[PDB]
Protein backbone atom coordinates (compact mmCIF):
# COMPACT_ATOMS: atom_id res chain seq x y z
CA UNK A 449 0.00 0.00 0.00
CA UNK A 450 0.99 3.57 0.69
CA UNK A 451 2.16 2.06 4.03
CA UNK A 452 -0.13 4.45 5.89
CA UNK A 453 -2.84 1.90 6.78
CA UNK A 454 -1.11 -1.28 7.96
CA UNK A 455 -3.21 -4.45 8.00
CA UNK A 456 -3.46 -4.59 11.79
CA UNK A 457 -6.09 -5.53 14.34
CA UNK A 458 -8.23 -7.56 11.97
CA UNK A 459 -8.86 -10.15 14.69
CA UNK A 460 -7.98 -13.14 12.49
CA UNK A 461 -4.88 -13.99 14.49
CA UNK A 462 -3.35 -17.38 15.25
CA UNK A 463 -0.65 -18.75 17.54
CA UNK A 464 1.94 -18.41 14.78
CA UNK A 465 3.87 -15.17 14.42
CA UNK A 466 2.70 -12.42 12.11
CA UNK A 467 4.72 -11.02 9.21
CA UNK A 468 6.39 -8.40 11.40
CA UNK A 469 5.56 -8.04 15.08
CA UNK A 470 8.84 -7.07 16.76
CA UNK A 471 8.94 -3.84 14.76
CA UNK A 472 5.28 -3.06 14.07
CA UNK A 473 4.80 -3.17 17.83
CA UNK A 474 6.62 0.14 18.25
CA UNK A 475 6.85 1.64 14.74
CA UNK A 476 4.02 4.17 15.08
CA UNK A 477 4.86 4.99 18.70
CA UNK A 478 8.49 5.69 17.82
CA UNK A 479 7.37 7.95 14.98
CA UNK A 480 5.23 9.93 17.43
CA UNK A 481 8.06 10.17 19.95
CA UNK A 482 10.74 11.26 17.48
CA UNK A 483 8.28 13.86 16.19
CA UNK A 484 7.65 15.16 19.70
CA UNK A 485 11.33 15.39 20.61
CA UNK A 486 12.09 17.10 17.29
CA UNK A 487 9.33 19.72 17.53
CA UNK A 488 8.30 20.96 20.99
CA UNK A 489 6.43 23.96 19.58
CA UNK A 490 3.16 22.07 19.23
CA UNK A 491 3.30 21.09 22.91
CA UNK A 492 2.70 24.64 24.13
CA UNK A 493 -0.37 25.03 21.92
CA UNK A 494 -1.70 21.61 22.93
CA UNK A 495 -1.27 22.49 26.61
CA UNK A 496 -3.13 25.77 26.11
CA UNK A 497 -5.95 24.15 24.14
CA UNK A 498 -6.46 21.42 26.72
CA UNK A 499 -6.21 23.95 29.55
CA UNK A 500 -8.73 26.56 28.40
CA UNK A 501 -11.29 24.03 27.16
CA UNK A 502 -13.61 23.24 30.09
CA UNK A 503 -11.24 21.81 32.64
CA UNK A 504 -11.70 18.71 34.73
CA UNK A 505 -8.33 16.98 34.96
CA UNK A 506 -9.86 13.90 33.33
CA UNK A 507 -11.00 16.03 30.39
CA UNK A 508 -7.79 18.06 30.29
CA UNK A 509 -5.61 14.95 30.29
CA UNK A 510 -7.60 13.11 27.64
CA UNK A 511 -7.76 16.17 25.39
CA UNK A 512 -4.03 16.83 25.79
CA UNK A 513 -3.03 13.21 25.12
CA UNK A 514 -5.29 12.90 22.09
CA UNK A 515 -4.32 16.28 20.62
CA UNK A 516 -0.61 15.57 21.12
CA UNK A 517 -1.04 12.12 19.58
CA UNK A 518 -3.20 12.89 16.54
CA UNK A 519 -1.16 15.58 14.77
CA UNK A 520 2.03 13.45 14.58
CA UNK A 521 0.37 10.22 13.48
CA UNK A 522 -1.94 12.06 11.07
CA UNK A 523 0.08 14.91 9.63
CA UNK B 524 9.16 2.45 7.66
CA UNK B 525 10.35 5.63 5.97
CA UNK B 526 6.95 5.97 4.27
CA UNK B 527 5.69 7.32 7.59
CA UNK B 528 6.47 10.84 8.82
CA UNK B 529 6.62 12.95 5.64
CA UNK B 530 7.92 16.46 6.14
CA UNK B 531 4.65 18.04 5.04
CA UNK B 532 4.82 20.85 7.57
CA UNK B 533 8.60 21.15 7.62
CA UNK B 534 8.16 24.84 6.86
CA UNK B 535 10.76 25.37 4.12
CA UNK B 536 8.23 27.47 2.24
CA UNK B 537 8.53 27.84 -1.53
CA UNK B 538 6.50 29.44 -4.30
CA UNK B 539 6.35 26.50 -6.70
CA UNK B 540 4.45 23.42 -5.64
CA UNK B 541 6.12 20.42 -4.04
CA UNK B 542 6.87 16.89 -5.23
CA UNK B 543 3.33 15.52 -4.77
CA UNK B 544 1.07 18.32 -3.60
CA UNK B 545 -2.02 16.95 -5.34
CA UNK B 546 -2.06 13.53 -3.68
CA UNK B 547 -0.45 14.50 -0.38
CA UNK B 548 -3.02 17.22 0.17
CA UNK B 549 -5.74 14.59 0.62
CA UNK B 550 -4.06 11.21 1.18
CA UNK B 551 -4.37 11.30 4.97
CA UNK B 552 -8.05 12.26 4.88
CA UNK B 553 -8.52 9.57 2.23
CA UNK B 554 -7.01 7.01 4.60
CA UNK B 555 -9.33 8.10 7.40
CA UNK B 556 -12.35 8.04 5.09
CA UNK B 557 -11.65 4.58 3.70
CA UNK B 558 -10.94 3.29 7.21
CA UNK B 559 -14.30 4.61 8.39
CA UNK B 560 -16.15 3.15 5.41
CA UNK B 561 -14.48 -0.22 5.99
CA UNK B 562 -15.12 -0.26 9.73
CA UNK B 563 -18.31 1.32 11.11
CA UNK B 564 -17.92 -0.26 14.54
CA UNK B 565 -15.70 2.42 16.05
CA UNK B 566 -18.33 5.12 15.50
CA UNK B 567 -20.64 3.69 18.17
CA UNK B 568 -17.79 3.45 20.68
CA UNK B 569 -16.66 7.01 19.98
CA UNK B 570 -20.22 8.31 20.38
CA UNK B 571 -20.58 6.42 23.66
CA UNK B 572 -17.28 7.73 25.04
CA UNK B 573 -18.02 11.32 24.05
CA UNK B 574 -21.56 11.17 25.43
CA UNK B 575 -20.45 9.78 28.79
CA UNK B 576 -17.38 12.03 29.18
CA UNK B 577 -18.49 15.24 27.47
CA UNK B 578 -20.05 17.54 30.04
CA UNK B 579 -20.98 20.15 27.42
CA UNK B 580 -21.76 20.11 23.72
CA UNK B 581 -18.42 21.47 22.52
CA UNK B 582 -16.41 19.11 24.72
CA UNK B 583 -18.43 16.16 23.43
CA UNK B 584 -17.95 17.09 19.78
CA UNK B 585 -14.22 17.73 20.21
CA UNK B 586 -13.75 14.39 21.97
CA UNK B 587 -15.73 12.60 19.26
CA UNK B 588 -13.79 14.13 16.39
CA UNK B 589 -10.40 13.53 18.01
CA UNK B 590 -11.24 9.90 18.77
CA UNK B 591 -12.56 9.35 15.25
CA UNK B 592 -9.34 10.80 13.82
CA UNK B 593 -6.69 9.23 16.05
CA UNK B 594 -7.65 5.56 15.81
CA UNK B 595 -7.78 5.22 11.99
CA UNK B 596 -4.45 7.05 11.81
CA UNK B 597 -2.92 4.97 14.62
CA UNK B 598 -3.98 1.81 12.78
CA UNK C 599 26.32 -25.70 -17.50
CA UNK C 600 23.79 -22.92 -18.23
CA UNK C 601 22.70 -22.28 -21.81
CA UNK C 602 19.72 -21.42 -24.01
CA UNK C 603 18.75 -23.74 -26.86
CA UNK C 604 16.43 -21.25 -28.63
CA UNK C 605 14.91 -24.13 -30.66
CA UNK C 606 15.41 -23.69 -34.43
CA UNK C 607 15.04 -20.90 -36.98
CA UNK C 608 11.73 -20.68 -38.83
CA UNK C 609 10.40 -18.29 -41.48
CA UNK C 610 6.78 -17.42 -42.25
CA UNK C 611 4.41 -15.07 -44.13
CA UNK C 612 3.05 -11.66 -43.11
CA UNK C 613 -0.21 -11.43 -41.19
CA UNK C 614 0.31 -14.54 -39.03
CA UNK C 615 1.74 -14.96 -35.52
CA UNK C 616 5.11 -16.68 -35.10
CA UNK C 617 6.52 -18.19 -31.91
CA UNK C 618 10.10 -18.23 -30.60
CA UNK C 619 10.75 -20.67 -27.77
CA UNK C 620 13.68 -20.15 -25.43
CA UNK C 621 14.64 -22.63 -22.69
CA UNK C 622 17.44 -22.10 -20.16
CA UNK C 623 18.31 -24.89 -17.74
CA UNK C 624 21.24 -25.56 -15.41
CA UNK C 625 20.37 -22.96 -12.77
CA UNK C 626 17.46 -21.65 -10.73
CA UNK C 627 15.52 -19.83 -13.43
CA UNK C 628 13.31 -17.85 -11.05
CA UNK C 629 15.70 -15.14 -9.89
CA UNK C 630 17.25 -14.09 -13.21
CA UNK C 631 15.94 -12.13 -16.19
CA UNK C 632 15.26 -12.88 -19.85
CA UNK C 633 15.76 -9.95 -22.19
CA UNK C 634 14.87 -10.92 -25.80
CA UNK C 635 17.19 -8.64 -27.76
CA UNK C 636 16.61 -8.32 -31.51
CA UNK C 637 19.44 -8.12 -34.04
CA UNK C 638 18.97 -7.07 -37.68
CA UNK C 639 21.42 -7.96 -40.47
CA UNK C 640 24.10 -5.30 -40.73
CA UNK C 641 22.46 -3.24 -37.99
CA UNK C 642 22.84 -2.70 -34.28
CA UNK C 643 20.94 -4.83 -31.79
CA UNK C 644 18.31 -3.22 -29.56
CA UNK C 645 16.70 -4.67 -26.45
CA UNK C 646 12.93 -4.79 -26.06
CA UNK C 647 11.66 -6.24 -22.77
CA UNK C 648 12.28 -8.31 -19.64
CA UNK C 649 10.29 -11.21 -18.29
CA UNK C 650 10.60 -12.25 -14.65
CA UNK C 651 9.72 -15.96 -14.66
CA UNK C 652 8.51 -16.00 -11.06
CA UNK C 653 6.11 -13.04 -11.10
CA UNK C 654 7.11 -10.76 -13.96
CA UNK C 655 5.09 -9.02 -16.63
CA UNK C 656 6.06 -7.54 -19.97
CA UNK C 657 8.00 -4.26 -19.88
CA UNK C 658 8.68 -3.79 -23.59
CA UNK C 659 10.74 -1.08 -25.17
CA UNK C 660 8.46 1.89 -25.98
CA UNK C 661 8.76 1.00 -29.67
CA UNK C 662 7.28 -2.44 -29.12
CA UNK C 663 4.41 -2.38 -26.61
CA UNK C 664 1.41 -3.90 -28.35
CA UNK C 665 3.72 -5.28 -31.02
CA UNK C 666 5.04 -8.32 -29.15
CA UNK C 667 3.98 -10.50 -26.22
CA UNK C 668 6.02 -12.49 -23.69
CA UNK C 669 4.98 -15.52 -21.63
CA UNK C 670 6.80 -18.08 -19.52
CA UNK C 671 6.43 -21.24 -17.46
CA UNK C 672 8.20 -22.01 -14.18
CA UNK C 673 7.90 -25.82 -14.24
CA UNK C 674 9.90 -26.26 -17.46
CA UNK C 675 12.10 -23.15 -17.03
CA UNK C 676 11.31 -21.75 -20.49
CA UNK C 677 10.39 -18.25 -21.66
CA UNK C 678 8.09 -17.76 -24.66
CA UNK C 679 7.95 -14.77 -26.99
CA UNK C 680 5.61 -14.53 -29.97
CA UNK C 681 5.04 -11.92 -32.67
CA UNK C 682 1.37 -10.93 -32.77
CA UNK C 683 1.81 -9.15 -36.12
CA UNK C 684 4.47 -9.64 -38.81
CA UNK C 685 5.04 -6.65 -41.05
CA UNK C 686 7.84 -6.38 -43.61
CA UNK C 687 10.03 -4.58 -41.07
CA UNK C 688 10.83 -7.42 -38.65
CA UNK C 689 13.34 -9.40 -40.74
CA UNK C 690 16.00 -10.30 -38.18
CA UNK C 691 17.27 -12.90 -35.72
CA UNK C 692 15.85 -12.67 -32.20
CA UNK C 693 17.98 -13.54 -29.18
CA UNK C 694 17.74 -14.46 -25.52
CA UNK C 695 19.96 -13.36 -22.65
CA UNK C 696 20.16 -13.80 -18.89
CA UNK C 697 19.88 -10.59 -16.91
CA UNK C 698 20.28 -9.66 -13.28
CA UNK C 699 17.76 -7.75 -11.17
CA UNK C 700 20.43 -5.32 -9.92
CA UNK C 701 19.93 -1.66 -10.79
CA UNK C 702 23.41 -1.65 -12.28
CA UNK C 703 22.67 -5.10 -13.71
CA UNK C 704 19.59 -4.38 -15.81
CA UNK C 705 21.94 -4.39 -18.82
CA UNK C 706 23.91 -7.39 -17.47
CA UNK C 707 23.40 -9.85 -20.32
CA UNK C 708 26.00 -12.43 -19.37
CA UNK C 709 24.80 -15.48 -21.32
CA UNK C 710 23.31 -15.74 -24.81
CA UNK C 711 21.87 -18.49 -26.97
CA UNK C 712 22.32 -19.39 -30.62
CA UNK C 713 19.68 -16.98 -31.93
CA UNK C 714 16.42 -18.04 -33.56
CA UNK C 715 16.13 -16.44 -36.99
CA UNK C 716 12.88 -15.41 -38.68
CA UNK C 717 12.34 -13.56 -41.96
CA UNK C 718 9.12 -12.64 -43.76
CA UNK C 719 8.40 -12.73 -47.50
CA UNK C 720 5.82 -13.81 -50.06
CA UNK D 721 5.25 13.00 -15.86
CA UNK D 722 7.13 10.62 -13.55
CA UNK D 723 6.43 6.98 -12.71
CA UNK D 724 6.81 7.27 -8.90
CA UNK D 725 9.32 4.48 -8.38
CA UNK D 726 8.68 1.06 -6.87
CA UNK D 727 6.18 0.46 -4.07
CA UNK D 728 7.71 -2.86 -2.97
CA UNK D 729 9.05 -1.76 0.40
CA UNK D 730 5.84 0.13 1.09
CA UNK D 731 3.94 -3.13 0.65
CA UNK D 732 6.33 -5.11 2.84
CA UNK D 733 5.87 -2.48 5.55
CA UNK D 734 2.09 -2.41 5.04
CA UNK D 735 1.26 -6.04 5.84
CA UNK D 736 2.32 -5.62 9.46
CA UNK D 737 -0.29 -8.03 10.84
CA UNK D 738 -0.55 -10.63 8.09
CA UNK D 739 0.45 -14.24 8.68
CA UNK D 740 2.68 -16.44 6.49
CA UNK D 741 2.31 -19.43 4.19
CA UNK D 742 4.63 -21.35 1.87
CA UNK D 743 4.43 -21.09 -1.93
CA UNK D 744 6.05 -24.11 -3.62
CA UNK D 745 3.89 -25.36 -6.45
CA UNK D 746 0.80 -25.78 -4.33
CA UNK D 747 0.52 -23.60 -1.24
CA UNK D 748 0.46 -25.18 2.23
CA UNK D 749 -1.27 -22.50 4.31
CA UNK D 750 -0.04 -22.79 7.89
CA UNK D 751 -1.42 -20.77 10.83
CA UNK D 752 -4.95 -22.10 11.24
CA UNK D 753 -7.04 -23.90 13.83
CA UNK D 754 -9.54 -26.71 13.37
CA UNK D 755 -11.78 -28.35 15.96
CA UNK D 756 -12.15 -32.13 15.90
CA UNK D 757 -14.54 -34.25 17.97
CA UNK D 758 -12.41 -37.24 18.89
CA UNK D 759 -14.11 -40.65 18.97
CA UNK D 760 -12.59 -43.16 21.41
CA UNK D 761 -14.96 -45.99 20.53
CA UNK D 762 -12.58 -48.77 19.46
CA UNK D 763 -9.26 -47.94 21.15
CA UNK D 764 -8.01 -50.84 23.27
CA UNK D 765 -4.77 -51.07 25.27
CA UNK D 766 -2.12 -53.48 24.06
CA UNK D 767 -0.95 -55.91 26.72
CA UNK D 768 -3.90 -55.54 29.07
CA UNK D 769 -3.74 -59.29 29.76
CA UNK E 770 15.68 -14.23 7.33
CA UNK E 771 14.10 -12.12 4.58
CA UNK E 772 15.14 -9.03 2.62
CA UNK E 773 12.15 -6.67 2.90
CA UNK E 774 12.39 -5.62 -0.74
CA UNK E 775 13.24 -2.12 -1.95
CA UNK E 776 12.23 1.25 -0.49
CA UNK E 777 12.01 3.15 -3.81
CA UNK E 778 8.35 4.10 -3.70
CA UNK E 779 8.62 4.43 0.06
CA UNK E 780 11.12 7.28 -0.32
CA UNK E 781 9.14 8.75 -3.22
CA UNK E 782 6.10 8.86 -0.93
CA UNK E 783 8.12 10.28 1.96
CA UNK E 784 9.41 13.38 0.14
CA UNK E 785 5.94 14.88 -0.14
CA UNK E 786 6.73 18.39 1.05
CA UNK E 787 10.09 18.73 -0.69
CA UNK E 788 10.73 20.80 -3.79
CA UNK E 789 12.37 19.72 -7.06
CA UNK E 790 15.91 20.50 -8.20
CA UNK E 791 16.78 19.36 -11.71
CA UNK E 792 20.45 18.30 -11.71
CA UNK E 793 22.11 17.68 -15.08
CA UNK E 794 25.49 19.38 -14.70
CA UNK E 795 26.16 19.79 -11.03
CA UNK E 796 22.84 21.06 -9.72
CA UNK E 797 20.36 23.64 -10.97
CA UNK E 798 18.20 24.54 -7.98
CA UNK E 799 14.92 26.01 -9.17
CA UNK E 800 12.09 27.25 -6.91
CA UNK E 801 14.46 29.78 -5.36
CA UNK E 802 13.98 33.03 -3.46
CA UNK E 803 16.17 36.10 -3.10
CA UNK E 804 15.97 39.75 -2.02
CA UNK E 805 17.54 42.48 -4.15
CA UNK E 806 18.18 46.22 -4.20
CA UNK E 807 18.03 48.30 -7.39
CA UNK E 808 20.40 51.27 -7.45
CA UNK E 809 18.82 52.97 -10.45
CA UNK E 810 20.88 56.17 -10.74
CA UNK E 811 22.48 55.35 -14.11
CA UNK E 812 19.41 54.74 -16.27
CA UNK E 813 19.37 56.92 -19.38
CA UNK E 814 15.92 57.74 -20.73
CA UNK E 815 17.46 57.27 -24.22
CA UNK E 816 14.89 59.58 -25.81
CA UNK E 817 15.81 63.04 -24.54
CA UNK E 818 17.20 64.20 -27.88
CA UNK F 819 18.50 11.09 -24.55
CA UNK F 820 20.11 8.30 -26.58
CA UNK F 821 23.68 7.03 -26.90
CA UNK F 822 25.68 7.13 -30.15
CA UNK F 823 29.16 5.66 -30.61
CA UNK F 824 31.33 6.10 -33.71
CA UNK F 825 32.76 3.38 -35.97
CA UNK F 826 36.53 3.56 -36.48
CA UNK F 827 39.52 1.71 -37.89
CA UNK F 828 42.78 0.51 -36.35
CA UNK F 829 45.86 -1.58 -37.11
CA UNK F 830 47.33 -4.85 -35.91
CA UNK F 831 50.35 -3.23 -34.17
CA UNK F 832 49.55 -2.72 -30.52
CA UNK F 833 48.08 0.71 -29.87
CA UNK F 834 45.58 2.32 -27.52
CA UNK F 835 42.36 3.08 -29.38
CA UNK F 836 39.44 4.49 -27.40
CA UNK F 837 35.88 3.38 -28.10
CA UNK F 838 34.07 6.34 -26.54
CA UNK F 839 30.40 6.01 -25.55
CA UNK F 840 28.41 9.24 -25.18
CA UNK F 841 25.08 9.49 -23.38
CA UNK F 842 23.11 11.90 -21.22
CA UNK F 843 22.32 12.94 -17.65
CA UNK F 844 19.78 10.15 -17.04
CA UNK F 845 21.05 7.03 -18.84
CA UNK F 846 24.80 6.58 -18.35
CA UNK F 847 26.03 9.41 -16.12
CA UNK F 848 24.71 7.63 -13.00
CA UNK F 849 24.53 3.95 -13.94
CA UNK F 850 26.98 1.18 -14.72
CA UNK F 851 27.89 0.96 -18.41
CA UNK F 852 28.21 -2.44 -20.08
CA UNK F 853 30.64 -3.20 -22.91
CA UNK F 854 29.99 -5.91 -25.51
CA UNK F 855 32.07 -7.17 -28.43
CA UNK F 856 30.49 -9.49 -31.01
CA UNK F 857 32.19 -11.80 -33.45
CA UNK F 858 30.03 -11.11 -36.53
CA UNK F 859 27.25 -13.50 -37.45
CA UNK F 860 26.97 -15.23 -34.06
CA UNK F 861 25.91 -14.49 -30.51
CA UNK F 862 27.70 -11.48 -28.97
CA UNK F 863 29.53 -12.18 -25.74
CA UNK F 864 29.84 -9.86 -22.75
CA UNK F 865 33.13 -7.98 -22.45
CA UNK F 866 32.65 -5.96 -19.23
CA UNK F 867 30.11 -7.09 -16.63
CA UNK F 868 30.53 -3.91 -14.58
CA UNK F 869 31.78 -0.36 -15.04
CA UNK F 870 35.45 -1.43 -15.13
CA UNK F 871 35.28 -5.14 -14.31
CA UNK F 872 35.77 -7.92 -16.87
CA UNK F 873 34.42 -11.43 -16.17
CA UNK F 874 36.67 -13.54 -18.40
CA UNK F 875 37.56 -11.34 -21.38
CA UNK F 876 41.13 -10.98 -22.61
CA UNK F 877 42.79 -9.71 -19.42
CA UNK F 878 45.28 -6.92 -18.81
CA UNK F 879 44.61 -5.34 -22.20
CA UNK F 880 40.86 -4.62 -22.16
CA UNK F 881 40.20 -1.97 -19.52
CA UNK F 882 38.14 1.22 -19.44
CA UNK F 883 35.94 3.41 -17.29
CA UNK F 884 33.49 6.30 -17.60
CA UNK F 885 33.76 10.04 -16.97
CA UNK F 886 30.63 12.09 -16.35
CA UNK F 887 28.44 11.75 -19.44
CA UNK F 888 31.02 9.72 -21.38
CA UNK F 889 32.11 6.10 -21.07
CA UNK F 890 35.16 4.71 -22.85
CA UNK F 891 37.00 1.46 -23.50
CA UNK F 892 40.72 0.97 -24.13
CA UNK F 893 42.31 -2.01 -25.89
CA UNK F 894 46.04 -2.78 -26.01
CA UNK F 895 47.94 -5.26 -28.16
CA UNK F 896 45.07 -5.59 -30.64
CA UNK F 897 45.64 -8.35 -33.18
CA UNK F 898 43.54 -9.59 -36.10
CA UNK F 899 41.51 -12.13 -34.10
CA UNK F 900 39.97 -9.18 -32.24
CA UNK F 901 37.98 -8.22 -35.35
CA UNK F 902 34.60 -7.55 -33.78
CA UNK F 903 31.82 -5.02 -33.42
CA UNK F 904 31.93 -3.32 -30.02
CA UNK F 905 28.73 -2.31 -28.25
CA UNK F 906 28.19 -0.07 -25.22
CA UNK F 907 24.84 -0.54 -23.47
CA UNK F 908 23.58 1.45 -20.50
CA UNK F 909 20.38 1.21 -18.49
CA UNK F 910 18.12 4.21 -18.98
CA UNK F 911 16.25 4.87 -15.75
CA UNK F 912 13.91 7.60 -17.01
CA UNK F 913 12.45 5.45 -19.79
CA UNK F 914 12.81 2.24 -17.73
CA UNK F 915 14.69 0.41 -20.48
CA UNK F 916 18.28 -0.40 -21.36
CA UNK F 917 19.81 1.78 -24.09
CA UNK F 918 21.90 -0.17 -26.59
CA UNK F 919 24.13 1.71 -29.03
CA UNK F 920 24.25 1.64 -32.80
CA UNK F 921 27.58 -0.13 -32.97
CA UNK F 922 31.25 0.30 -33.90
CA UNK F 923 32.83 -1.41 -36.90
CA UNK F 924 36.25 -1.81 -35.31
CA UNK F 925 38.45 -3.11 -38.13
CA UNK F 926 42.05 -3.97 -37.25
CA UNK F 927 44.71 -4.11 -39.96
Ligand SMILES: *[C@@H]1O[C@H](CO)[C@@H](O[C@@H]2O[C@H](CO)[C@@H](O[C@@H]3O[C@H](CO)[C@@H](O)[C@H](O)[C@@H]3O)[C@H](O)[C@H]2NC(C)=O)[C@H](O)[C@H]1NC(C)=O
Nearest residue numbers: 641644659660661662663664665685686687688819820913
Ligand atom coordinates in the same frame (compact mmCIF):
# COMPACT_ATOMS: atom_id res chain seq x y z
C1 LIG G 1 6.44 5.40 -28.34
O1 LIG G 1 7.68 6.03 -28.58
C2 LIG G 1 8.58 5.26 -29.39
C3 LIG G 1 9.89 6.02 -29.43
O2 LIG G 1 10.23 6.52 -28.15
C4 LIG G 1 7.97 5.04 -30.77
O3 LIG G 1 8.86 4.23 -31.52
C5 LIG G 1 8.84 4.54 -32.92
O4 LIG G 1 8.26 3.46 -33.66
C6 LIG G 1 8.22 3.65 -35.09
C7 LIG G 1 7.54 2.42 -35.66
O5 LIG G 1 7.43 1.39 -34.70
C8 LIG G 1 9.63 3.86 -35.62
O6 LIG G 1 9.58 4.08 -37.03
C9 LIG G 1 10.59 3.26 -37.66
O7 LIG G 1 11.81 3.98 -37.78
C10 LIG G 1 12.86 3.25 -38.42
C11 LIG G 1 14.15 4.04 -38.29
O8 LIG G 1 15.13 3.43 -39.12
C12 LIG G 1 12.44 3.05 -39.87
O9 LIG G 1 13.49 2.41 -40.57
C13 LIG G 1 11.17 2.19 -39.91
O10 LIG G 1 10.75 2.01 -41.25
C14 LIG G 1 10.05 2.79 -39.04
O11 LIG G 1 9.51 3.87 -39.77
C15 LIG G 1 10.28 5.03 -34.91
O12 LIG G 1 11.62 5.20 -35.34
C16 LIG G 1 10.26 4.79 -33.40
N1 LIG G 1 10.87 5.90 -32.70
C17 LIG G 1 12.06 5.82 -32.08
C18 LIG G 1 12.74 4.48 -32.15
O13 LIG G 1 12.55 6.77 -31.49
C19 LIG G 1 6.61 4.36 -30.62
O14 LIG G 1 5.96 4.27 -31.88
C20 LIG G 1 5.72 5.15 -29.66
N2 LIG G 1 4.47 4.44 -29.45
C21 LIG G 1 3.27 4.98 -29.69
C22 LIG G 1 3.27 6.38 -30.21
O15 LIG G 1 2.23 4.36 -29.50
